[PDB]
Amino acid sequence: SHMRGPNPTAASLEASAGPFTVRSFTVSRPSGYGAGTVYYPTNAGGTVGAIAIVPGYTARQSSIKWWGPRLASHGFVVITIDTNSTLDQPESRSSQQMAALRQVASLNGTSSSPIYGKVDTARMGVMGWSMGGGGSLISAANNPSLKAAAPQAPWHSSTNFSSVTVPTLIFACENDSIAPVNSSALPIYDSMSRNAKQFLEICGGSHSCANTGNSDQALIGKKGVAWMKRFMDNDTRYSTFACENPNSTRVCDFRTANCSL
Numbered sequence: 188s189h190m191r192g193p194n195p196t197a198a199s200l201e202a203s204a205g206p207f208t209v210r211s212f213t214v215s216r217p218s219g220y221g222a223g224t225v226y227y228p229t230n231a232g233g234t235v236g237a238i239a240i241v242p243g244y245t246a247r248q249s250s251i252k253w254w255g256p257r258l259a260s261h262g263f264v265v266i267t268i269d270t271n272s273t274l275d276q277p278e279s280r281s282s283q284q285m286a287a288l289r290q291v292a293s294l295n296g297t298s299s300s301p302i303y304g305k306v307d308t309a310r311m312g313v314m315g316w317s318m319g320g321g322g323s324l325i326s327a328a329n330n331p332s333l334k335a336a337a338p339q340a341p342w343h344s345s346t347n348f349s350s351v352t353v354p355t356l357i358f359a360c361e362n363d364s365i366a367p368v369n370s371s372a373l374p375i376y377d378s379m380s381r382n383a384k385q386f387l388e389i390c391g392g393s394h395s396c397a398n399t400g401n402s403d404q405a406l407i408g409k410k411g412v413a414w415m416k417r418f419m420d421n422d423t424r425y426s427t428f429a430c431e432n433p434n435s436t437r438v439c440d441f442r443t444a445n446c447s448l
């Protein structure tokens with residue numbers, strides 16, 4: 188429905204950057220969250236969807252920052268936030284995530300903003316690490332008009348997300364001792380029976396295995412961008428990339444359902 192950029196390849200999705208040049212700015216007066224950096228394409232040649240990304244407990248934008256330029260360069264507006272407190276819980280993280288999306292939607296209609304007219308505010312996604320990944324799934328449960336979710340090493344006090352109808356990719360980290368796969372990511376994935384979903388576990392990964400500076404950005408970036416293109420943009424050129432077992436020796440557990448190639 189909303190295809191931008193050239194036909195993808197493994198090589199184009201695994202590279203450092205997509206086709207679009209990326210700029211960023213710090214939000215001046217963050218509305219309902221602590222701080223925010225907005226990454227955006229200067230030359231997408233069409234409006235793009237928006238993605239809000241939340242860190243884990245104690246953590247800040249640095250932890251998840253790499254996703255900003257990576258996603259934006261493929262044709263998205265990305266906001267990475269600091270929460271009002273580093274010690275905010277998942278419900279609060281979800282509220283702040285949606286507040287960041289709301290503010291991006293607002294700045295799209297503000298003529299002084301660098302993202303004036305760049306955003307399709309009907310096409311939105313959510314991402315985050317740990318309690319911020321838990322917050323993303325809460326966002327998805329409460330706001331089913333969201334187009335995609337792709338949390339990493341998610342954690343929540345409940346693993347029951349059976350109501351989620353949003354297409355959800357879960358990144359997991361095999362050797363996570365904070366949000367162990369067996370007791371967090373996997374039961375969350377298994378709870379969801381009404382959506383397109385995927386589970387991708389990185390071999391030997393600590394809890395930070397999908398964070399800034401990780402050594403698997405080729406694969407994790409490929410998958411995050413493909414999921415977002417396929418579901419935020421309804422771009423079926425990405426159906427294989429989004430839905431396929433990537434056949435990587437860095438993946439120690441792969442599962443997917445309701446995800447057509």
Ligand SMILES: [Mg+2]
Binds near residue numbers: 243316317318319
């Ligand atoms: Mg956490």
